[PDB]
């Protein structure tokens, strides 16, 4: 009853949790049949993907360019270099091109809008690679690795500490979706964004679901079960950037941050992690998830992937969430 | 009755309309199984092939890339960095490495001399992905554009309004062997090359049509079916580059211009497209073909790599031309 | 009785003679499969490749890329703005990214030791793409290409002329296991590694072969079957780069080196190849064996991905070594 066959993947916001649920089954399935049992399934055979990248990466780039291949497609790694995007040529006509030649893109940029744009032009999949407002493409496989873990999503209650940026919104944008509480904290000053909070709580409620928002590190890891967190210390080479490290004091999460959470907590960190975020005891602990998490990009950008481009249908049994 | 296998496209002067009518009708067989019938064919599986960039693209990086995979073969980027052309190494060295480890070459270069050395010394297909001198492979999706517009083409009047560069010396080195005239306007100054023009002339003479060469935008426009343009603003950055702007003033393909020639007019633009070559009315208009011809340049250097490395003959009917 | 499906490939010394050979078999086997019988060998289907270059190349770039995939995997290119590496992550934590995500990695990089770290941490095998220490996949397909002119290997004396770097330690740790001598010039200042040229006696003694050291030119090309040099000068730019210059007189290989050798000498170069090292006389000379040399880096990367990540047995008989 689900069918995402020809969508864009510009933000979970969109998605009803009976779809992101039909994309990490899928992600369980594809998983299961390569990495088990071993099958070779050239569900894309005769596709190409153009990945349009305006930063660097390895996780996306990695994930996305191996995965789109397992399955028969061929990726198209493309950069500032490469496209004449915003030196030599307007938005509107890359849409066209792109619509021509690739059978979707996706697109890791710093503004969002881009991606509206280019996705109201374009008259194929535009997937989400990363953007100022949202990163939906790394929760799917956060989500997939707690599922892995805990045999269930529902009920559990994740704790984000650090900065309010995309991650933390595509929390925002689905965790209720899938029973799940969220406490997070972030400094003063670098909140989560209004309308997108907004959403949350409207989520949360029709979900019956709790959404705590706090600038205390201790008061949001306490009593959740996921421990979350993410790099805030700003690229921006600045001695003026110590603002971060000032205001970020007491946001390392370490064995005292966990020391008030439930006893069966785990930790995530979507990476590359420096030692400000975590330190080494949490981070290469037995309770940290993060490798784990990493590998589960390629399946789940694979899933998205086959949803939005084909008619397959899952072999696997639903899995429980 | 045409054997084209094992030869390189350098420019279109040394193919007979015979043979470059093969090739379209290849172009619109692929396109037709492929992009209709959905059919897939690894008619290159087992092939490589080498695309050395000195300059930008996405046209033809994407176009040959996707269209190179679509068929089973690995497509392979390469540029400045890579390479060793220039920096580190000769050029009859490169070209016996490449002719080992590749099926073909694509090349965009500055020189179209550094094509014809690399095609003496290499022992595979050399083809040329635009040069100094010419584009032939943008005259491909061009014809194949125009034919699936008119249903044939033969007799049309194509209207060249720009500066003299490789687009046009590639038009006037195929025009007349398709029976069709050109009338070309070029500022005085920027006329397209003599060695060029004098062999369009003997063409237009053994095919009985017509070449026009003005410096007058509207008598190059007046009777034609086809206006075509392309950016005559040069990249090079300079307050000094004005002499472009001053010298090609009037030269903007406006529904002015469109007012002179046939009323079955049509139009096209290489791209990436400025406001400068023409403006949105016509640019966006119904008559614009602009992105079918975007879309051709894939198809085209498809059948372009089909027919210089593998035996397969087209299925589709010999299209009308 | 020969297990190298799982093992890393960083240099040649953990090696047998009876490994190595298995290697220059299977190069052997699927070059005349797929050179010679024209068959399509998907013997790499659903596998993944990352490239880690941290240098330019086009050689290892080229045949690594088109040999992976002309067996039907997917090679990832990836340098040092792609990668994390050194600026954004740890080294353990990118084993681990890469070790879920690629089948096996094939790195370029400056330090030896950083190969070694990448393979303690990834679960995936490594191959070395050059090193400062070695570079024995240059080796092999120096080994196969003399195997292919020679019918075989033991009993020639190796003669190197050039600096004491990579090459001619991957060379050390490896003729004396074929049952070949080697005799090598370089420069006072200039020797190669101390505990390497340990070893390499240690072997010619275990195997019954020579081993001479000079700082003499013709007294290394003395009587020697196989003349080989390599580029000396070094990128580092600088006037004062002239002690190279300085140091390296007398070592051009030309006819004059020649007279002294074998009457059945044949000429090795890595490439890319300068008029310091070796004039166009030798170079371009029938003896010289550069190209075929060029060539087998494809068929022997492919070698090494083939027994190193399948079960893939040899067809053909094995080649007289």
């Not at 953007?131 to 939906?136: E, F, I, Q």
């Not at 690795?145 to 045999?151: C, D, F, N, P």
């Not at 949350?200 to 421990?227: C, F, I, R, W």
């Not at 971060?244 to 992690?273: E, I, N």
Request: net charge neutral; aromatic share 8%; charged share 25%.
């Amino acid at each position: 009853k689900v069918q995402l066959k020809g969508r864009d993947l510009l933000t979970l916001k969109n998605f009803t949790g009976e779809e992101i649920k039909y994309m990490l089954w899928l992600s369980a399935d594809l998983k299961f049949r390569i990495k088990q049992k071993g099958e070779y399934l050239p569900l894309l055979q005769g596709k190409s993907l153009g990945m349009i990248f305006e930063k660097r990466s390895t996780r996306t780039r990695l994930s996305t360019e191996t995965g789109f291949a397992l399955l028969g497609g061929h990726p198209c790694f493309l950069t500032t270099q490469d496209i004449h995007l915003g030196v030599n040529e307007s938005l509107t006509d890359t849409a066209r091109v792109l619509s021509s030649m690739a059978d979707a893109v996706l697109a890791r940029v710093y503004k969002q809008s881009d991606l509206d744009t280019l996705a109201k032009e374009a008259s194929i999949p535009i997937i989400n690679g990363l953007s100022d407002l949202y990163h939906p493409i790394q929760i799917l496989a956060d989500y997939l690795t707690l599922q892995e873990h805990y045999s269930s999503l529902k009920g559990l209650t994740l704790s984000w500490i650090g900065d309010g940026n995309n991650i933390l919104h595509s929390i925002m944008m689905s965790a209720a979706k899938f029973g799940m509480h969220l406490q997070a904290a972030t400094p003063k000053g670098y909140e989560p964004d209004a309308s997108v909070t907004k959403l949350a709580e409207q989520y949360a409620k029709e979900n019956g679901t709790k959404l705590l928002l706090t600038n205390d590190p201790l008061e949001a890891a306490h009593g959740g079960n996921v421990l979350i967190t993410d790099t805030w210390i700003s690229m921006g080479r600045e001695e003026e950037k110590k603002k971060r490290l000032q205001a970020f004091q007491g946001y390392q999460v370490t064995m005292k941050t966990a020391k008030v959470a439930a006893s069966d907590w785990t930790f995530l960190h979507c990476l590359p992690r420096k030692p400000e975020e975590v330190d080494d005891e949490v981070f290469y602990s037995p309770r940290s998830l993060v490798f784990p998490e990493a590998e589960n990009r390629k399946w789940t950008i694979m899933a998205v992937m086959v949803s939005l481009l084909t008619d397959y249908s899952p072999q696997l049994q639903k899995p429980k969430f």
